[PDB]
């Protein structure tokens, strides 16, 4: 770098009657610097691209792995070629005439041999051809399997998708950016996958929301009848989606309806959880309250306000829930009355 | 027992306990001993060696451990309304897969507390992290899944208060970075996806953006938005970086909405594009800074199709860089080696003016100075955000430094024209 | 609960801390980390000091920062933080 | 000679210092250049709080030497110490 | 204070105080609604105090902010036009901080009160004069709205209607100065009000005395003041001495002195020579001690300007008001020709006096109808930096040079 800066400063003295003398005086220093640069480039190449720390940083950049390794190799090759071109411009054409220039030419040939990337491109193409994928034709690919502790098929219904589609899309983008040949039929398949990707994301979100609703039901089994209407609506929507086919053109409207239903189910589950916590706290408090007429009236009024709010909440099976709450209040009042 | 356990678990009492612990921090950090010395005589050694890099000195490493398990700084932006702290967008909790993929910490500047004054938990990994200047009780962050959500810093819920829905018209692709755009009059927090959708949203409706469009240019070719840049005030005008490696100037408003111009000077994917971060008397809106993984920190002009000048000091894929907020000459730089290489254009052009090499390749991902630029913040692979203080060895901008920087820019244009003429003459016959 | 407990353990994570106690006026602490008879006795003592400080504040200004009032004495930087529902009394150090 | 006035200027013009009183051991401020009643009332309140702190200390161990009582209030959070020989007032905000 | 000192001056107490003070010192060492600094903080007309028992059928006479406590407004009312049975004239007050429309002491006056101002030398009272030949003192201590004491309406005191008065001398040695329409310069003893402590029949220009319609004195220069004229002969009034009186008949207008204050802005550049003046001929000019002629002028509005009293910090701003119902605050460092902060009142009603606060934090405005409107004057224009004060002084010197150059250009370019 210092020699390059000195050469840049002295470039204004090319016509002056000291350029050849300076070149003769600094030929040995330039050859030594070129050998040092070639050694540094060889050391950088010996830094393994497949497990590079810079490769980890690039993965942190979120680029595809193989494409990123190819990009790092291309950047290293670009740096080496730029250094060689700068040296050739500084020392004139036919730089291999000197012994240092011939050694630099040999090192550059070794680097060019060691920095192909065509082998990486061929390996990526061979892996893609071996894969040969295509999914999402069916909407709810029911991946029902015997869960740990439950031999019943745990239906992980979803579109026929995985992170491999995202890897293919990233690989296609990287190949387009870097200029490579590839299995253009696989490219068309990747284009279709990129088209269908937002719908797949919506389907995965719907699966997550349905799982959250199931978890909410498992928690508040004490209120599981109260959100029965939302559960039935979600079941009907899920049945419609399972009847749908992911290759169908109606996949977008079906996903929109499923998203609306999932949002409704989530909001209802949250509101029901809050209300049920309030009701259970009120019931325990009315059971344990101080045995006074005003205290009983206050607890009953709180329960009644909660009941009116729940009735406004538009839950399912409101009469059944009212009957259960009345029976519980009867048991609590009975314990109090006996005491 | 039961009463104490109920009181601690009670919501109002737990919130009061959290506020009291915040006060405990604000006292414990502010409680110096009795016979402390402040005569300033002990600074003879500090000022004696300050003649070799007063402009660079680490202040405090406001890292953590419950949220920094192999989770590098996904973003950095110093706060404005309460500038006494900074953010630390940890990467995915890969080393702690039990934890959620997004745990956003807050680095400290006012207090010597390793823990933060808030938290923004995220189900997925936080891609970008923005601190809202116009809203003082929250922050802005985007999931690596692609959800741009908000978790308040003044409330009691590190989880997303409102997440961007995974709508097909929304950013299904990963939301690479967002900017806290829009003033109080018309707030439109813009976004950029992996597909690159310019979700010029509205302040409230986190599920219905005000404006959304997947952007494309160069014969409708979709461009992955590597970063978002624009002039300060130019609502329509914007700049962007490309994964395929082609910076394209963007129009937001107008019938030509999208990347209108395309000034391509790099040789690969664009790392970071900060605009003219310090404009004095001159108007530097016709040029900006640029960073790329092609081992060369570029400077491309909004007017010049090819880039203006190239600082190719990087021996490998660089990480991130930005111009100084105060000095137009100074421009912070950072690569994978952790080489803090802030260069002052009017002062030291060829070599980086401030070379601060942290050994072991501290894995910088974003290097952002303070809003006032007192200390430059950058974080390694772990997340140890080292705030190297921008001391007056480079921090001081001259009175004529705006005019001198404009003259240096004109000289750079003249030298570039001379180099173009020399290259034209070098064409043989 | 665990949030307040973790906050207490973080504020008392400083080495050599005498004792950080979430406390109460009832002579027992909400969350202390000392000897139980000493903790209850100091909780009652801090309750007495808290009532006297509350009366002193109401005599001086009845709308002040009546949620915490430390005692940064040389022996123990007794950080009393009487909350509205619970209370806290952190006999802490003069360093951190 | 000028040490008392220098201390008053130090604890009255510190980082957000409310004002310094080189008061006697009776609690109430000595040098009050305005309506003294507010100073005397606040200082009697602080003396009662300091006696409460001494009572709590003696509940723990009466042989503890105190540096200051870090009272926190919205009027003037006093890091002062009423003593049996005099009363040196230092009311300042540590964050300010 | 002896016991307090002995508690302080004990050696053990002093050492303990020093140690505790050093230890404690070492230990403890919306926005959009706030975004109206350069667009509203200099002019925020907020306090519309108008007591209908007094404001209706009455005008504003003068105004001031009390030096003892600037939280109030010590201002009077003019002649109540349509109150033949009701009180002739009184003084209202609207507290700046406290929201109380009623004056703390409505000193109703039997005659028509000319003008008034507060006084911090004996801060329990207020002082003023009448439009018929009286000067009276009233105090917030007493419980009578009438005058606590009256100057003797005789040959000793200001026989003609004296529209200007000021308590000359601070609490060190106060002697209430009075200047009459008959030119009776009267420094009156603020305690013994039977006869004024000074009785000087002021006159100028070979004893042909002028109508001193605008008294003003430099800040602290108790030996020399400045008096406006109906005939315009504003001659520098020496205040202390045997030959004290209006000496240098500087003529910087073409009409009666509307309202003039000493341009006593304070900073790096001491502009005590300059004094802001306002004319009856719509001629707002900058007369000065050295500049016998007007140094620079301003003649924007057609109607006569009401009064001029610039703020005491920035020499750039010339606080005044237009006769057609608009404010007039031209910042010299900002512009020299156009009025910079020419805020417009509602309804374009005229006023006869206006004043910035004693701290300069707010510049209130009177009304012909009596609606006292107070406009906040923040730091956008009133915050004078020492450089900014020096910059304004240098701009004033450059403007003087430019005025001399323009006079030379007119003298050598007049075709004769």
Curated annotation (Swiss-Prot), chain A:
Superkingdom: Eukaryota
UniProt region (Interaction with DYNC1LI2), positions on chain: 73-224
Consequence of changing residue 20 to C: In CMT2O and SMALED1; slight increased BICD2-binding
Residue intervals passing through the bilayer: none
Subcellular location field: Cytoplasm, Cytoskeleton
Task of the protein: Cytoplasmic dynein 1 acts as a motor for the intracellular retrograde motility of vesicles and organelles along microtubules. Dynein has ATPase activity; the force-producing power stroke is thought to occur on release of ADP. Plays a role in mitotic spindle assembly and metaphase plate congression.
Disease: Charcot-Marie-Tooth disease, axonal, type 2O: An axonal form of Charcot-Marie-Tooth disease, a disorder of the peripheral nervous system, characterized by progressive weakness and atrophy, initially of the peroneal muscles and later of the distal muscles of the arms. Charcot-Marie-Tooth disease is classified in two main groups on the basis of electrophysiologic properties and histopathology: primary peripheral demyelinating neuropathies (designated CMT1 when they are dominantly inherited) and primary peripheral axonal neuropathies (CMT2). Cortical dysplasia, complex, with other brain malformations 13: An autosomal dominant disorder characterized by global developmental delay with impaired intellectual development. Some patients show signs of peripheral neuropathy, such as abnormal gait and hyporeflexia. CDCBM13 is associated with variable neuronal migration defects resulting in cortical malformations.
Family membership: Belongs to the dynein heavy chain family.
Protein name as catalogued: Cytoplasmic dynein 1 heavy chain 1
Origin species: Homo sapiens
Name of encoding gene: DYNC1H1
Curated annotation (Swiss-Prot), chain B:
Cellular localisation: Cytoplasm, Cytoskeleton; Cytoplasm
Top-level division of the source organism's lineage: Eukaryota
Annotated phenotype, changing residue 38 to C: In NEDMIBA; loss-of-function variant; does not rescue neurodevelopmental defects in zebrafish morphants
Keywords recorded for this protein, A-Z: Acetylation, Cytoplasm, Cytoskeleton, Disease variant, Dynein, Host-virus interaction, Intellectual disability, Microtubule, Motor protein, Phosphoprotein, Repeat, Transport, WD repeat
Gene Ontology BP annotations: microtubule-based movement; transport along microtubule
Modification comment: Pyrophosphorylation by 5-diphosphoinositol pentakisphosphate (5-IP7) promotes interaction with DCTN1. Serine pyrophosphorylation is achieved by Mg(2+)-dependent, but enzyme independent transfer of a beta-phosphate from a inositol pyrophosphate to a pre-phosphorylated serine residue.
GO cellular component assignments: centrosome; cytoplasm; cytoplasmic dynein complex; cytosol; dynein complex; microtubule; vesicle
UniProt KW Metal-binding keyword: no
GO molecular function: dynein heavy chain binding; dynein light chain binding; microtubule motor activity
Disease implication from the record: Neurodevelopmental disorder with microcephaly and structural brain anomalies: An autosomal recessive neurodevelopmental disorder characterized by global developmental delay, severe intellectual disability, microcephaly, dysmorphic facial features, and cerebral malformations including simplification of cerebral gyration, agenesis of the corpus callosum, and brainstem and white matter hypoplasia.
Family recorded in the similarity comment: Belongs to the dynein intermediate chain family.
Listed name of the protein: Cytoplasmic dynein 1 intermediate chain 2
Record organism: Homo sapiens (Human)
Gene from which this protein is expressed: DYNC1I2
Part of the full-length chain shown: 210 to 638 of 638
UniProtKB/Swiss-Prot annotation, chains C, D:
GO biological process, one term: microtubule-based movement
Positions in coiled-coil regions: none
GO molecular function, one term: identical protein binding
The keyword rRNA-binding is annotated on this UniProt entry: no
Pfam families tied to this protein: Robl_LC7 (PF03259)
Signal sequence bounds: none
InterPro entries (alphabetical): DYNLRB1/2 (IPR016561), Roadblock/LAMTOR2_dom (IPR004942)
Keyword ATP-binding included in the entry's annotation: no
Compartments where found: Cytoplasm, Cytoskeleton
Expression (tissue specificity): High expression in heart, liver, brain and pancreas; moderate in placenta, skeletal muscle and kidney; low in lung, prostate, testis, small intestine and colon. Isoform 1 expression is up-regulated in 64% hepatocellular carcinoma (HCC) patients.
Keyword list, A-Z: Acetylation, Cytoplasm, Cytoskeleton, Dynein, Microtubule, Motor protein, Transport
Residues with the N-acetylalanine modification: 2
Gene Ontology CC annotation, any one: cytoplasmic dynein complex
Assembly behavior: Homodimer. The cytoplasmic dynein 1 complex consists of two catalytic heavy chains (HCs) and a number of non-catalytic subunits presented by intermediate chains (ICs), light intermediate chains (LICs) and light chains (LCs); the composition seems to vary in respect to the IC, LIC and LC composition. The heavy chain homodimer serves as a scaffold for the probable homodimeric assembly of the respective non-catalytic subunits. The ICs and LICs bind directly to the HC dimer and the LCs assemble on the IC dimer. Interacts with DYNLRB2. Interacts with DYNC1I1 and DYNC1I2.
Chain's role: Acts as one of several non-catalytic accessory components of the cytoplasmic dynein 1 complex that are thought to be involved in linking dynein to cargos and to adapter proteins that regulate dynein function. Cytoplasmic dynein 1 acts as a motor for the intracellular retrograde motility of vesicles and organelles along microtubules.
Sequence similarity: Belongs to the GAMAD family.
Protein name, entry field: Dynein light chain roadblock-type 1
The gene coding this protein: DYNLRB1
């Amino acid at each position: 770098n210092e020699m390059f800066r000195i050469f840049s400063r002295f470039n204004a003295l090319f016509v002056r009657p000291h350029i050849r003398g300076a070149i003769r005086e600094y030929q040995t220093q330039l050859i030594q610097r070129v050998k040092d640069d070639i050694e540094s480039l060889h050391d950088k190449f010996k830094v393994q691209y497949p497990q590079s720390q810079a490769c980890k940083m690039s993965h942190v950049r979120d680029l595809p792995p193989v494409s990123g390794s190819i990009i790092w190799a291309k950047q290293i090759d670009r740096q080496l070629t730029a250094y060689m071109k700068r040296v050739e411009d500084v020392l004139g054409k036919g730089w291999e005439n000197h012994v240092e220039g011939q050694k630099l030419k040999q090192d550059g040939d070794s680097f060019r041999m060691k920095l192909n990337t065509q082998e990486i491109f061929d390996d990526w193409a061979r892996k893609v051809q071996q894969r040969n994928l295509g999914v999402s034709g069916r909407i709810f690919t029911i991946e029902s399997t015997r869960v740990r502790g439950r031999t019943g098929n745990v239906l992980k219904l979803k579109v026929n998708f995985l992170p491999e589609i995202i890897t293919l899309s990233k690989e296609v983008r990287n190949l387009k950016w870097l200029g490579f040949r590839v299995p253009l039929a696989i490219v068309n398949k990747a284009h279709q996958a990129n088209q269908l990707y937002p719908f797949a994301i919506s389907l995965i979100e719907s699966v997550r929301t349905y799982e959250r609703t199931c978890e909410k039901v498992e928690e508040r089994n004490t209120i599981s009848l109260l959100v029965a209407g939302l559960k039935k609506e979600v079941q009907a929507l899920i049945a419609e989606g399972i009847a749908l086919v992911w290759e169908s053109y109606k996949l977008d409207p079906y996903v929109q309806r499923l998203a609306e239903t999932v949002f409704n189910f989530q909001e209802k589950v949250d509101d029901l959880l809050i209300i049920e916590e309030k009701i259970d706290l009120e019931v325990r408090s009315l059971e344990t309250c101080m045995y006074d007429h005003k205290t009983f009236s206050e607890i009953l009024n709180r329960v009644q306000k909660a009941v009116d709010d729940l009735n406004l909440h538009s839950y399912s099976n409101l009469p059944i829930w009212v009957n259960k709450l009345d029976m519980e209040i009867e048991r609590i009042l009975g314990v109090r009355l006996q005491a | 027992e039961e009463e104490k356990q109920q009181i601690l678990h009670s919501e109002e009492f737990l919130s009061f306990f959290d506020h009291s612990t915040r006060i405990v921090e604000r006292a414990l950090s502010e409680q110096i001993n009795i016979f402390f010395d402040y005569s300033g005589r002990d600074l003879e050694d500090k000022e004696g060696e300050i003649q070799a890099g007063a402009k660079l000195s680490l202040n405090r490493q406001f890292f953590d451990e419950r949220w920094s398990k192999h989770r590098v700084v996904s973003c950095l932006d110093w706060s404005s309304q309460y500038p006494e702290l900074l953010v630390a967008s940890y990467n995915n909790n890969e080393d702690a897969p039990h934890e959620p993929d997004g745990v956003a910490l807050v680095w400290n500047m006012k207090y010597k507390k390793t823990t933060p004054e808030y938290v923004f938990h995220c189900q997925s990994a936080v891609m970008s992290a923005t601190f809202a200047k116009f809203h003082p009780n929250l922050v802005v962050g985007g999931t690596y899944s692609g959800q741009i959500v908000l978790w308040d810093n003044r409330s009691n819920k590190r989880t997303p208060v409102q997440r961007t829905p995974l709508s097909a018209a929304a950013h299904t692709h990963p939301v690479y970075c967002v900017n806290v755009v829009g003033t109080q009059n018309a707030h439109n927090l813009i976004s950029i996806s992996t597909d690159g959708k310019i979700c010029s949203w509205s302040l409230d409706m986190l599920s219905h953006p005000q404006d959304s469009m997947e952007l494309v240019h160069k014969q409708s070719k979709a461009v992955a938005v590597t970063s978002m840049s624009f002039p300060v005030g130019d609502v329509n005008n914007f700049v962007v970086g490309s994964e395929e490696g082609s910076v394209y100037t963007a129009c937001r408003h107008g019938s030509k909405a999208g990347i209108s111009e395309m000034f391509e000077g790099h040789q690969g994917p664009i790392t970071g594009i900060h605009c003219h971060a310090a404009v004095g008397a001159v108007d530097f809106s016709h040029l900006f800074v640029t960073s790329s993984f092609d081992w060369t920190v570029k400077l491309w002009s909004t007017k010049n199709n090819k880039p203006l000048y190239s600082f190719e000091d990087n021996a490998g894929y660089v990480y991130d860089v930005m111009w100084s907020p105060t000095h137009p000459a100074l421009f912070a730089c950072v690569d994978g080696m952790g080489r803090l290489d802030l260069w002052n254009l009017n002062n030291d052009t060829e070599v980086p003016t401030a070379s601060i090499s942290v050994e072991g390749n501290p894995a910088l991902n974003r290097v952002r100075w303070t809003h006032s630029g007192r200390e430059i913040a950058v974080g390694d692979s772990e997340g140890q955000i080292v705030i190297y203080d921008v001391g007056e060895q480079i921090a001081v901008p001259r009175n004529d430094e705006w005019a001198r920087f404009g003259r240096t820019l004109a000289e750079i244009n003249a030298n570039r024209a001379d180099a173009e003429e020399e290259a034209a003459t070098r064409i043989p016959a | 609960m665990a949030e307040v407990e973790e906050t207490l353990k973080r504020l008392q994570s400083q080495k050599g801390v005498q004792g950080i106690i979430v406390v109460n006026t009832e002579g027992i602490p909400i969350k202390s980390t000392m000897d139980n008879p000493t903790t209850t006795q100091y909780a009652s003592l801090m309750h007495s000091f808290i009532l006297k400080a509350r009366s002193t504040v109401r005599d001086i200004d009845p709308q002040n920062d009546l949620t915490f009032l430390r005692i940064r004495s040389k022996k123990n930087e007794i950080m009393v933080a009487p909350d509205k529902d619970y209370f806290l009394i952190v006999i802490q150090n003069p360093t951190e």
